[PDB]
Structure 1
Amino acid sequence: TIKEMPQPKTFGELKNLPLLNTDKPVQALMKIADELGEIFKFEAPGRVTRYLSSQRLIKEACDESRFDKNLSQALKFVRDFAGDGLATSWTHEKNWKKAHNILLPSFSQQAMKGYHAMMVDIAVQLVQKWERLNADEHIEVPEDMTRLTLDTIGLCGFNYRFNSFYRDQPHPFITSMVRALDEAMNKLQRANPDDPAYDENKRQFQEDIKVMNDLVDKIIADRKASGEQSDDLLAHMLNGKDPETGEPLDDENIRYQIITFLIAGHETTSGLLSFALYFLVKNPHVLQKAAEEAARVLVDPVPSYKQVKQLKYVGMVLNEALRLWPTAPAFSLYAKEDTVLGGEYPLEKGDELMVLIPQLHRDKTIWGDDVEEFRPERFENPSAIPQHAFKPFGNGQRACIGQQFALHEATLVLGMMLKHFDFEDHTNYELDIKETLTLKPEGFVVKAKSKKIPL
């Protein structure tokens, strides 16, 4: 009962490699999944993986007794600046489990109560920016959402203000972070990496690692010296001990966690807010329902933590945006031991799988025929969703540690935006999804007309 896997078109000795040599490789893989179905083999010189798209097979990929997290080539390149922080570590590295145990209490739903006031500080800066636009002016949506998420992670994470709303050119740390992510990603499509064409890329990459390390190491040192007692992510790492080994993180690994929280959280969360606003302006009845909830619930000039927990329909809007365009759209696994997937695909120890999340979230056997419609009400009875059907935050012990942070920030911000403004898709925007490590609607712009409600 061994079934042979489909495979997309090949390019002689390059196998399937040239199919990823494209501006939008995840969108290209989705089309291949539409043509080939729930599983297909993908070969490149010296490597193979199998792309999975159905809930039936991903339910089994998510079995942690059989499969563990693999570092994709993209995460191996990001590792050159994120080191052994949580997202770029293997599960078997000592620093993965130590940092996971130390940081988990700082990321819980209960922990969000202590970060709430500083998330509101940055959210009120975004609202005031928009209130202060002139009549003719419009909003660059991903750009302003990115200023917000970076500043919120910097403030809530280590008490540092990047002051992105005071700037055209970002803080030099952010410029270096973004240029290092961009070079790590560009390295995936680089035939001759030692060509002299890339000498400047190499020099600038090392310069950017140094800018990041120098700022973050200085912030850690300033804190240790001052002895200032705080309760932010940096405080928890300075003070915390892993209950298992009894050891704290060392200062180098703390620096890698801080850089990881910025890289892992900034564009995924700004992409989520950008797609959510895109889908609301494209579905005015849904926008009106979400705006009615915001006006009902957010009765004070500043939202409270409790009021954010009552934005239930806004939370469903965000889940439905994550269903259609999950902003960290794939994750990689390897077989811990020889095993058979789905009763028909034998795998050897070490074989790789790729979970293609946007295609999982379009599985009609789970969601029904209307998978392309934006309908938040499909999250009304979440106990009915089968296991492992909805995976925007990854899987198991290697799932997103920042999930509660991301969702509380996005619910708070989207709530305030709907309370304070009416929106206009003034250009009749044509969705264009730019791919980096994450997804975003490039060039999405709106006009916001103030409801003139004070802060």
Structure 2
Amino acid sequence: TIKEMPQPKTFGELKNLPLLNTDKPVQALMKIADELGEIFKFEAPGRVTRYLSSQRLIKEACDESRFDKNLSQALKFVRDFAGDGLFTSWTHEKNWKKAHNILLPSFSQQAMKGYHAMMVDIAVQLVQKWERLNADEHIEVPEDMTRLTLDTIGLCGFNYRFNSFYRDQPHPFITSMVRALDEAMNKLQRANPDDPAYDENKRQFQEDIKVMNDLVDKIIADRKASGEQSDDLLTHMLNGKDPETGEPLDDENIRYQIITFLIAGHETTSGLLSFALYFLVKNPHVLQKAAEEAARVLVDPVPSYKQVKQLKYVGMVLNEALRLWPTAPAFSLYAKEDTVLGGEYPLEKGDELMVLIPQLHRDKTIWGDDVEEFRPERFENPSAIPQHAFKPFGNGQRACIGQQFALHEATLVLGMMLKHFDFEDHTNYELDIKETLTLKPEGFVVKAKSKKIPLGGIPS
């Protein structure tokens, strides 16, 4: 039964563009979803896309035989600095499968065991800082989670220390990164982006790229200026060869990979740890249930790989946090052939679909009526969750290659945070979600009162 595609207010030759003139476009797209239903068309000057919000429709969207990952306009803009990398490349492009096969073993279960030692190295530094704060000072959660995650990916992946905790204002790379993603977004708003009115936006943009590129040259420098025998992410980028083609990645792609993993490998993780702590301090005895498990399991000075893997309720909180507010709230898809979505909406070959992940996770027919409440107990048995009902890490082969990396780091850190500290909502903080393609709460502050539990000495 062919249904006609519903669509919000149109605005002349700008179509649906003036509907997103906020710094919270995704949150605006969510409000539209509650208004028009499970699917709606969003038209732009040169773009046409369809946002999905129901598990039923997204179920078929995740069918790889019918749909493949599409570069949305957001990703097409990120490709200006991410380029031929693993995040902003087409599936049919030569370098995706080439880099996928080379870098996938770097995220195997055996690789995760190797990262753990360095993950605790950075996680302890986080505890060190909070332990050494005077009683009056505030804890800036998103700023310090950014310090935690950036140092972690740089160390575990590239054997490189940003030393963000030894820095006052955020790392020069972070400033360039945030401004770049902030420039990728809002450019989605410009009707004529090539209008010279945004010339200062462009030249500021390619200055930030130069900064990111300068960092890459230094990571390669420290590596080639060896340096002990290594076996991390960068080691495989330089030496790894694709079994199917026998070739190693060319340097133009390698630099694109480093940029990709430096940004994609910490930004969304930082937001998650920020969102999680927010939902914990907002839900007291849920935080209590989680605080106990940390104290009950982590019975040593520093956590082990086995101990993090058995912090099961902590992972439930992280997933429930990923449910209500996925830090990567959308991924795009295109129809490989002509087909009919949900037996109602006909699609041309190449038509784009945007999976609005927050509204997916708020499907009342999947989770119930308490879609807004924070119940980590939903993830008691993951078996009881329908297929493609909960996808904060994308879909299929184009899914997040560092999902285990994030979840382990997010569990390891949050566990130590609950073991060593009690937390207080210093303000009656009202959630303000800042959008820079990704999602991260802004101006979130707390105060930690130590339990005075000592550490080890992070030796490995």
TM range (shorter): over 0.9
Q: Give the 5 Å matches for 1:161-172.
A: 161-172=161-172
Question: Per-residue deviation at 1:32?
Answer: 0.9
Q: Secondary structure at the match of 2:346?
A: strand
Distance change (3 Å), C-alpha of 1:42 and 1:189: closer
Q: Is 2:178–2:436's contact at 8 Å kept on the other side of the alignment?
A: no
Distance 1:335 1:281 in 2: 43
Corresponding residue for residue 152 of structure 1: 152
Q: Is 1:145–1:273's contact at 8 Å kept on the other side of the alignment?
A: yes
Q: Is 1:229–1:235's contact at 8 Å kept on the other side of the alignment?
A: no
Q: Deviations over 1:396-449 (max 9, x none)?
A: 011111101110110000000000000001211111111111111111111100
1:23 aligns with 2:23: yes
Distance 1:446 1:214 in 2: 35
CA-atom RMSD in angstroms? 1.4
Question: Per-residue deviation at 1:173?
Answer: 3.0
Question: Per-residue deviation at 1:199?
Answer: 3.0
Question: Per-residue deviation at 1:189?
Answer: 2.2
Percent identity of equivalent pairs? 100
Distance 1:177 1:47 in 2: 26
Distance 1:368 1:117 in 2: 40
Distance change (3 Å), C-alpha of 1:452 and 1:321: same
Long gaps (5+) in structure 1:
none
Q: Is 2:23–2:186's contact at 8 Å kept on the other side of the alignment?
A: no
Question: Per-residue deviation at 1:380?
Answer: 0.6
Question: Per-residue deviation at 1:317?
Answer: 0.3
Q: Deviations over 1:336-388 (max 9, x none)?
A: 00011111111110111110000000111111111111111110111111110
Query: Which shifted more, 163-172 or 146-155?
Result: 163-172
- State TM-score, norm by structure 1: 0.97
Q: Is 2:431–2:441's contact at 8 Å kept on the other side of the alignment?
A: yes
Question: Per-residue deviation at 1:27?
Answer: 1.1
Q: Is 1:69–1:90's contact at 8 Å kept on the other side of the alignment?
A: yes
Q: Deviations over 1:53-111 (max 9, x none)?
A: 11111010000011111111111111111111100000011100011111111112331
Query: Which shifted more, 187-196 or 269-278?
Result: 187-196
Question: Per-residue deviation at 1:19?
Answer: 1.1
Distance 2:175 2:38 in 1: 40
Question: Per-residue deviation at 1:244?
Answer: 1.1
Corresponding residue for residue 264 of structure 1: 264
Q: Is 2:139–2:446's contact at 8 Å kept on the other side of the alignment?
A: yes
Question: Per-residue deviation at 1:192?
Answer: 4.2
Query: Which shifted more, 124-133 or 5-14?
Result: 5-14
Question: Per-residue deviation at 1:278?
Answer: 0.5
Q: Deviations over 1:241-296 (max 9, x none)?
A: 11111111122211111110121122210110011000011111110010100001
Q: Deviations over 1:154-201 (max 9, x none)?
A: 111111111111112333333333332222223222344344443333
Q: Secondary structure at the match of 1:448?
A: strand
Q: Deviations over 1:191-229 (max 9, x none)?
A: 443444433332222222222223313422442353631
Q: Is 1:142–1:274's contact at 8 Å kept on the other side of the alignment?
A: yes
Corresponding residue for residue 458 of structure 2: none
Query: Which shifted more, 141-150 or 190-199?
Result: 190-199
- State TM-score, norm by structure 2: 0.96
Q: Is 1:79–1:88's contact at 8 Å kept on the other side of the alignment?
A: yes
Q: Is 1:157–1:258's contact at 8 Å kept on the other side of the alignment?
A: no
Q: Is 1:339–1:347's contact at 8 Å kept on the other side of the alignment?
A: yes
Question: Per-residue deviation at 1:20?
Answer: 1.8
Number of positions where the alignment pairs a residue of Structure 1 with one of Structure 2: 455
Long gaps (5+) in structure 2:
456-460
Question: Per-residue deviation at 1:395?
Answer: 0.5
Q: Secondary structure at the match of 2:42?
A: strand
Distance 1:240 1:312 in 2: 35
